[PDB]
């Protein structure tokens, strides 16, 4: 997921700019976004949200707007229990478990339902589960006493000022997410939100693993107020952003650093290349227009290539295998952008899978390690070019096997197929540096692949008066059997041809295709 | 200077555009939420009902084996019961909007029984607590505490 908020001073017309760009699975049901527009005499909200939610998480109206990315707030703890004498050892003594005998019905293949017993054991920590390996784990989830999640989002998106907005956020009812804000008043904001347990020791990595469940020493009970969390408002840079990267480069120049917060809040790992493109695209550009802003969102740079090809190519060219040489020349001529016509893209990917692991996040193979002091220009280079060339050798085999050739056109193999619409793909994996994202699936017997996750709801809003907004939903606004609104937007996505989002009554009335009057 | 004058809807109606995007207009909050619930049932009714069913911890009951792991995960963490509590702990105003949302879904299924998939019919009628349950499952037992990280 990507998120951008531009301050007036950094734009041409003087109105804030906002980008809603959540990345989620295209198939998981509870991750499906829906686009809607609500209007009553006292408020207006437009935007997308996961199906089933009565409130719009990615919203905007004539006054303000927000967006969300994943920050992974470690809001729960998995404790390893030390079983002993029917109970579990805690603070030197054997404590008994809380036991409740519950049950549920299991539907049978014949239509009937068998009654199945379910025992629920709990430690002072929380519910206990037994992993397949035999490890007894107790999960303690923070914020179970915050029932106002839905109303907080509702009050946040209907806020009449940044002040009211923050006040709503301060209730700490939304347990996670990075949230970005922007309004017609000119304020932009980034907030590493969520309910974080107050701890006296241990870094995030410690709390992300199995914490010892045999001592009150690790039993947290309180949570941090909104003021303890990393946040940025109107920074000197004139923008804020987050692309799932740790909250350490929310803007440029930064307004804080890791040392300013407890070490268990977020990680301090190398920022993905997409995240880096994000910081560059915003900081490097000034006097932005809505159009230019939109154009920047389409960025699909093979950043990984700029970091490795200068070292890989020369090394490959000296290899005796003529095919490795040809591959080297093919990659050398590539403009390093994931376009439909790129004959080198697929090949580069395959090598990347080996050079940096399947998820493309591996760091072990760079000559210069990542550094927060050079957050958008590291890691760099190839550590062992000889090895890398072997990896390329293997990649050539893999590319030919998967696609039938080392120089197959990216867009010929990468397709976006919904119902009977089959359009050419572009852009790609975020970890390779592509900002606009399409996590392509493995190919089928014919080398064809489609998006498994990536761009879903995408909108860019300018808070002028009236506001101007554009957007697109990859998989349409409906998945009900036989609907014509599932595959009717993917063709436009393939051309980055965005729809103007209609907020004004007159605009709506002009585009209405169906009227459903109702009464409650 | 000041935002463009807001629209004052004088009747409850949904204006759908060419892409299936619903523009829900209500004379008040509850009305708009009802409209929102109707639209969602229209566009994603089957999966919403199924998910709501799971949030009740009825996954194994309604659809068998393939939904049993999630049922155990949600029951052991008392999600469906906590959803009842959270629902009851809502401010009267907002609880009214949630009731309206569920009513909109029920209403749509009522007026369009043919659009609802057989397997998820038994879920109906849905309630405000169901809306709370699902949201509670999505936030705390999917995003924050996934069953994968606990079990491995
Ligand atoms: O907030 C959301 O809707 C989830 C998507 C964020 C991400 O996965 O980065």
mmCIF file with all atom_site columns, C-alpha atoms and ligand atoms in Angstrom, chain A residues 1-2 22-24 31 33 50 57-58 68-71 153 177 244 453, chain B residues 143, ligand 1:
data_model
loop_
_atom_site.group_PDB
_atom_site.id
_atom_site.type_symbol
_atom_site.label_atom_id
_atom_site.label_alt_id
_atom_site.label_comp_id
_atom_site.label_asym_id
_atom_site.label_entity_id
_atom_site.label_seq_id
_atom_site.pdbx_PDB_ins_code
_atom_site.Cartn_x
_atom_site.Cartn_y
_atom_site.Cartn_z
_atom_site.occupancy
_atom_site.B_iso_or_equiv
_atom_site.pdbx_formal_charge
_atom_site.auth_seq_id
_atom_site.auth_comp_id
_atom_site.auth_asym_id
_atom_site.auth_atom_id
_atom_site.pdbx_PDB_model_num
ATOM   1  C CA . UNK A 1 1   ? 0.000   0.000  0.000  1.00 0.00 ? 1   UNK A CA 1
ATOM   2  C CA . UNK A 1 2   ? 1.092   3.553  -0.776 1.00 0.00 ? 2   UNK A CA 1
ATOM   3  C CA . UNK A 1 22  ? -4.181  0.264  -0.554 1.00 0.00 ? 22  UNK A CA 1
ATOM   4  C CA . UNK A 1 23  ? -2.650  -3.032 -1.718 1.00 0.00 ? 23  UNK A CA 1
ATOM   5  C CA . UNK A 1 24  ? -4.534  -6.249 -0.915 1.00 0.00 ? 24  UNK A CA 1
ATOM   6  C CA . UNK A 1 31  ? -10.211 -7.987 1.612  1.00 0.00 ? 31  UNK A CA 1
ATOM   7  C CA . UNK A 1 33  ? -12.981 -3.089 -1.346 1.00 0.00 ? 33  UNK A CA 1
ATOM   8  C CA . UNK A 1 50  ? -13.789 -3.619 2.958  1.00 0.00 ? 50  UNK A CA 1
ATOM   9  C CA . UNK A 1 57  ? -12.095 3.527  5.786  1.00 0.00 ? 57  UNK A CA 1
ATOM   10 C CA . UNK A 1 58  ? -10.621 5.230  2.685  1.00 0.00 ? 58  UNK A CA 1
ATOM   11 C CA . UNK A 1 68  ? -4.495  3.661  5.277  1.00 0.00 ? 68  UNK A CA 1
ATOM   12 C CA . UNK A 1 69  ? -1.423  1.447  4.930  1.00 0.00 ? 69  UNK A CA 1
ATOM   13 C CA . UNK A 1 70  ? -0.294  -1.461 7.091  1.00 0.00 ? 70  UNK A CA 1
ATOM   14 C CA . UNK A 1 71  ? 2.167   -0.676 9.910  1.00 0.00 ? 71  UNK A CA 1
ATOM   15 C CA . UNK A 1 153 ? -13.631 5.946  11.810 1.00 0.00 ? 153 UNK A CA 1
ATOM   16 C CA . UNK A 1 177 ? -2.621  0.998  10.587 1.00 0.00 ? 177 UNK A CA 1
ATOM   17 C CA . UNK A 1 244 ? 4.542   -0.111 4.429  1.00 0.00 ? 244 UNK A CA 1
ATOM   18 C CA . UNK A 1 453 ? -2.536  -8.768 -5.145 1.00 0.00 ? 453 UNK A CA 1
ATOM   19 C CA . UNK B 2 143 ? -4.990  -7.889 10.959 1.00 0.00 ? 143 UNK B CA 1
HETATM 20 O O1 . LIG C 3 .   ? -5.669  -0.755 5.549  1.00 0.00 ? 1   LIG C O1 1
HETATM 21 C C1 . LIG C 3 .   ? -6.053  -1.581 4.726  1.00 0.00 ? 1   LIG C C1 1
HETATM 22 O O2 . LIG C 3 .   ? -7.104  -1.498 4.088  1.00 0.00 ? 1   LIG C O2 1
HETATM 23 C C2 . LIG C 3 .   ? -5.163  -2.787 4.487  1.00 0.00 ? 1   LIG C C2 1
HETATM 24 C C3 . LIG C 3 .   ? -4.119  -2.595 3.382  1.00 0.00 ? 1   LIG C C3 1
HETATM 25 C C4 . LIG C 3 .   ? -2.775  -2.029 3.873  1.00 0.00 ? 1   LIG C C4 1
HETATM 26 C C5 . LIG C 3 .   ? -1.520  -2.857 3.529  1.00 0.00 ? 1   LIG C C5 1
HETATM 27 O O3 . LIG C 3 .   ? -1.637  -4.089 3.408  1.00 0.00 ? 1   LIG C O3 1
HETATM 28 O O4 . LIG C 3 .   ? -0.457  -2.252 3.402  1.00 0.00 ? 1   LIG C O4 1
#
